[PDB]
Amino acid sequence: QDLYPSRQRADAEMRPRLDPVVHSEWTNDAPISARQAAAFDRDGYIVLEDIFSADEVAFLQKAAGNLLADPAALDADTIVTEPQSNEIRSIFEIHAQSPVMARLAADARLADVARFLLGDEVYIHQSRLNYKPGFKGREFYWHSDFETWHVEDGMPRMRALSMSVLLAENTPHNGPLMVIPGSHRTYLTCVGVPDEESLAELAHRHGIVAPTGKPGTVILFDCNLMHGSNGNITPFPRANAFLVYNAVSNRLEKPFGVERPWFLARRGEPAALRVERGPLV
Ligand SMILES: [Fe+3]
Known about the structure:
Elements: E1 14-16, H1 34-43, E2 45-48, H2 54-68, E3 79-81, E4 88-92, H3 94-97, H4 99-106, H5 108-117, E5 122-132, E6 140-144, H6 145-153, E7 160-166, E8 178-179, E9 186-188, H7 196-206, E10 218-222, E11 226-229, E12 238-247
Antiparallel strand pairs: 1-9, 2-10, 3-4, 4-5, 5-12, 6-11, 7-10, 7-12, 8-11
Subunit structure: Homodimer.
InterPro entries: EctD, Phytyl_CoA_dOase-like
Organism: Sphingopyxis alaskensis (strain DSM 13593 / LMG 18877 / RB2256) (Sphingomonas alaskensis)
């Protein structure tokens, strides 16, 4: 019933993973190589480079800039801010509010990878446009998306993946997203923040890797990969579009816990995203 119980005991447990990581057999029809599929299964993430042209990247950058500079045009429920100061930090449900980001989510070069890896038709569980500025950028502490999606949102199986489309450069120096490769095969229960000893254990066994890339690079990770990021004192901002794909067969149920606002998760009984091909501009 609850295959992945968390926030119930007082102590923390490392339970095994009971879902595949790659939900499809590999063949020459797959949108990715055999080695990339194997890397995903083993590490829980992979990095796609050079899949969008220079113009498409400039287009997506240009577009994100406009969204971020124009909060009057959008649903106030979806905005996240520097409190106080009036600075836009995130925008949820951009895939619904932005015809450009809607088209991004549906691009084959992303959606076909997700349908393969998730071995199913897919829909967006959540989307974000994110801007971490220079000088004053916060850390996001270590967490597993799935642990929250399960407990708070009712996502029942590890059958989803996040896609982070970089829009500003990630150097090693400006708090790029950091992962613990392999951590996706352990479900770490929370007493919802993971605990120091477990975290240390994972990082000692597996190490840390913080993949970088020029704008337009795409970082894909399993829903249960343990990840996070340092702050950023540099003048160089971080900005990405964050897209979470879920298998349609893995639709949300009632939360495995006590309750979460609509813009954080499509609770609905949703339908398959329709893949679009050819360039963006
Ligand atoms: Fe996250």
